[PDB]
Amino acid sequence: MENFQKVEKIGEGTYGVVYKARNKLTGEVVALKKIRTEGVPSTAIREISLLKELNHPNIVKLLDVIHTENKLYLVFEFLHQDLKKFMDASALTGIPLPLIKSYLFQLLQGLAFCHSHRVLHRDLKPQNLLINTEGAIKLADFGLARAFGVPVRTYTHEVVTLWYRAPEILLGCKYYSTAVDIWSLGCIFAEMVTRRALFPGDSEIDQLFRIFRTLGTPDEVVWPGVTSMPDYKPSFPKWARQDFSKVVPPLDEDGRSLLSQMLHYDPNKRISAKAALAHPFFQDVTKPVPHLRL
């Protein structure tokens, strides 16, 4: 804009370009997101504005919402790195378990907070989990999906990833629950441990079938109501469930136990963020600092 000197393009967001910028008047450095098209839904602005009050140490702070000139800009707290990039950079040796645990623990605290205020993310992924040199990790873009919806392609035509999508969404459920975020976080947890995406689908059916091939094709015993879902087909192949010891080796039993609860098929059975914070996996949790080269 005019009150902000663009320092650099941080990246291409799912809704528009994102710039690192300096507030010319207060000198603060922030992240500036330009969102998408003929006027901007007034319903969206009321909803987004509401998010300015959703403040927590593990949630990227929304500093301002600007509509003027009939364009939509969101100003956010700035963090130097995202988890996707950090994982790529840690691929050779992997992120130390104490750091994975600390990150998961903080992420769950952030989810527990938003969920307690009835705000869902809906599109969690490594790219929107931001980290700093102090060992903190924060969730970015909470609540935006509800306001703008999640597109197939971003403004740049890039394909939005389906890797972290909960199965109830893939099966066509119209109503999402907080459980969809726990699923996504479980997939990210598995990816930090193994250094390979858990379910890297490249289409909705491929994503769904990758889940089925690992966790078993769901049925009425494990997921009451599943055969009645909108996109469920009796013709889906029936795959047997695999053992977790084979899915996220060499994670220990506390870790495997927690992950299994975060990946339950039935959204109602899936562990809540609050209950996950009490899981024995976090008994020895600590707050290490990452080796961050900026």
Q: Which of 21, 31, 62, 107 binds ligand Z04 (CB under 6 A)?
A: 31
151 lines the binding site for ligand Z04 (CB under 6 A): no
Q: Which CB, 9 or 46, lies closer to ligand Z04?
A: 9
Residues 48-67 that bind ligand Z04 (CB under 6 A): 60
How many helices (H) and strands (E) in the chain? 10, 8
Closest separation between CB of residue 288 and ligand Z04, Å?
20
Crossing angle (nearest 10°) for helices 253-262 and 179-194: 140
10 lines the binding site for ligand Z04 (CB under 6 A): yes
Q: Which of 4, 19, 73, 78 binds ligand Z04 (CB under 6 A)?
A: 78
In 10 A of CB 59, how many CB atoms? 23
18 lines the binding site for ligand Z04 (CB under 6 A): yes
In 10 A of CB 146, how many CB atoms? 17
211 lines the binding site for ligand Z04 (CB under 6 A): no
CB under 6 A: which stretch of 10-18, 40-48, 198-206, 223-231 binds ligand Z04?
10-18
Closest residue to ligand Z04, Cβ-based?
11
Q: Which CB, 127 or 217, lies closer to ligand Z04?
A: 127
Crossing angle (nearest 10°) for helices 179-194 and 83-90: 20
Query: Scanning the structure block, which residue is given the tokens 């990452």?
Result: 290
Distance (Å, whole) CA 265 – CA 166: 9
Q: Which CB, 40 or 97, lies closer to ligand Z04?
A: 40
Which tokens go with 187?
A: 């997939």
Instruction: Please check whether residue 179 is in contact with residue 268, taking contact to mean a CB–CB distance below 8 angstroms.
Output: yes
191 lines the binding site for ligand Z04 (CB under 6 A): no
Residues 6+ apart with CB under 8 A from 289: 133, 134, 135
Q: Which CB, 33 or 264, lies closer to ligand Z04?
A: 33
Q: Which of 130, 185, 247, 262 binds ligand Z04 (CB under 6 A)?
A: 130
15 lines the binding site for ligand Z04 (CB under 6 A): no
80 lines the binding site for ligand Z04 (CB under 6 A): yes
147 lines the binding site for ligand Z04 (CB under 6 A): no
User: In a 10 Å sphere around its CB, with 0-12 CB exposed, 13-18 middle and 19+ buried, how is residue 294 labelled?
Assistant: exposed
13 lines the binding site for ligand Z04 (CB under 6 A): yes
User: In a 10 Å sphere around its CB, with 0-12 CB exposed, 13-18 middle and 19+ buried, how is residue 47 labelled?
Assistant: middle
Residues 6+ apart with CB under 8 A from 286: 98, 101, 102
82 lines the binding site for ligand Z04 (CB under 6 A): yes
Q: Which of 33, 122, 270, 279 binds ligand Z04 (CB under 6 A)?
A: 33
Residues at the site binding ligand Z04, with contacts judged by CB under 6 A: 10-11, 13, 18, 31, 33, 60, 76, 78-82, 127, 130, 140
